[PDB]
Amino acid sequence: SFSGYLKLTDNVYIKNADIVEEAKKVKPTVVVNAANVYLKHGGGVAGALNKATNNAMQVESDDYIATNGPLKVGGSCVLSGHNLAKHCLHVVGPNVNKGEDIQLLKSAYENFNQHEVLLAPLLSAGIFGADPIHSLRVCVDTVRTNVYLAVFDKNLYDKLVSSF
Ligand SMILES: NC(=O)[C@H]1CCCn2ccnc21
Question: In Å, what resolution does this model reach?
Answer: 1.1
Q: Is the dihedral of CA 1, 145, 87, 121 positive or negative?
A: negative
CA distance 106 to 67: 27
48 lines ligand 1 (CB under 6 A): yes
Number of domains comprising the chain: 1
Instruction: Report the separation in Å between the CA atom of 18 and the middle of ligand 1, taken as the mean of its atom positions.
Output: 6
Ordered strands of the 117-120 beta sheet: 6-7, 12-16, 146-151, 117-120, 30-35, 87-92, 76-80
Which region holds residue 55: left if phi is over 0, alpha if psi is between -120 and 50, else beta? left
- Residue 97 neighbours by CB under 8 Å, 6+ apart: 127, 128, 129
* Domain of residue 41, residue span: 1-164
CA distance 110 to 93: 11
119 lines ligand 1 (CB under 6 A): no
